[PDB]
Amino acid sequence: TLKLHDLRPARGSKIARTRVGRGDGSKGKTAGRGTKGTRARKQVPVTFEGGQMPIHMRLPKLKGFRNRFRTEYEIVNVGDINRLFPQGGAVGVDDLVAKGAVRKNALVKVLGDGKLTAKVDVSAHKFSGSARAKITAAGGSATE
């Protein structure tokens, strides 16, 4: 039987800790610093480039504004419908959450990437223009 003295970690998982500043056969007196300046006793901040105007102040700001009232959709492709529902039938928003194609509690949106060959009948929000084509050309319908 396996006992508590037969358990051991996977090879490569547990590696040894580097104990620094413990003599000349390891990382010796200065512990990897070497210097006599700032880097020997302190950290240098990332924003500081020695005194010139840094990269986050030389460059202009990215143009524009963020839309506060932006609505966001969760995206499903019509080629994913063909793989998830190879028998066709009715496809709702609840049917896509259980199949893992889409997140919960969010407005869905069918896009038209892929090849739909099944006869599905899908209710969603805001169909794409090339997704309304492939659903009816496969034999089904698409309502809001």
Partner 1 sequence: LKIDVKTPAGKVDGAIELPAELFDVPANIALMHQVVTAQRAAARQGTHSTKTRGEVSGGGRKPYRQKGTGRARQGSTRAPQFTGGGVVHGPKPRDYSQRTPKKMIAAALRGALSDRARNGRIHAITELVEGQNPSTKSARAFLASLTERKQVLVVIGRSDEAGAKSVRNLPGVHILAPDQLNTYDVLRADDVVFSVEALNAYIAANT
Partner 2 sequence: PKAKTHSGASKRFRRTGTGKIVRQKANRRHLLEHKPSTRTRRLDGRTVVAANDTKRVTSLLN
Partner RNA sequence: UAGACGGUGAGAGCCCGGUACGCGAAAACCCGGCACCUGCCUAGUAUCAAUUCCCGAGUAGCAGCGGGCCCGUGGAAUCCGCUGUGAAUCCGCCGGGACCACCCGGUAAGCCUAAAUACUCCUCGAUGACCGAUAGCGGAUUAGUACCGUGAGGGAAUGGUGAAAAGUACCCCGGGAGGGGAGUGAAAGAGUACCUGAAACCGUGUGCCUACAAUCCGUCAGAGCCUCCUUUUCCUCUCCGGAGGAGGGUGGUGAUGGCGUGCCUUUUGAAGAAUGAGCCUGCGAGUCAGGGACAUGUCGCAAGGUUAACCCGUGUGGGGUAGCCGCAGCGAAAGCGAGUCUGAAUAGGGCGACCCACACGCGCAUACGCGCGUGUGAAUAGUGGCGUGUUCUGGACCCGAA
Partner RNA sequence: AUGCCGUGGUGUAAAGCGUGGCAGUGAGACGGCGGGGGAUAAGCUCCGUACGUCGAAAGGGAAACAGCCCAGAUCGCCGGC
Partner RNA sequence: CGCGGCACAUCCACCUUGUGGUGGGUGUGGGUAGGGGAGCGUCCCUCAUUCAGCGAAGCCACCGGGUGACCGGUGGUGGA
Binding site residues, RNA, CB under 7 A: 3-5, 9-21, 26-37, 39-46, 63-67, 69-71, 73-75, 77, 99-105, 109, 111-113, 115, 117, 126, 128-131
Note the helical H segments in the chain: 55-58, 78-84, 93-98, 129-138
Nearer to partner 2, 14 or 61 (CB): 61
Nearer to RNA, 117 or 123 (CB): 117
- Which listed option, Mg ion, partner 1, partner 2, none, makes contact with residue 3 (CB within 5 to 8 Å by class)? partner 1
> Which residue is listed with tokens 């419908």?
81
Nearer to partner 1, 3 or 58 (CB): 3
CB-based contacts of 49, cutoff 8 Å, min separation 6: 55
* Number of residues this chain uses to bind partner 2 (CB under 8 A): 11
Is residue 43 a contact point for Mg ion (CB under 5 A)?
no
Query: What is the rounded CA–CA span in Å between residue 144 and residue 126?
Result: 7
What are the DSSP E strand ranges found in the chain?
74-77, 89-91, 108-111, 120-123, 141-143
- Which listed option, RNA, Mg ion, partner 2, none, makes contact with residue 141 (CB within 5 to 8 Å by class)? none
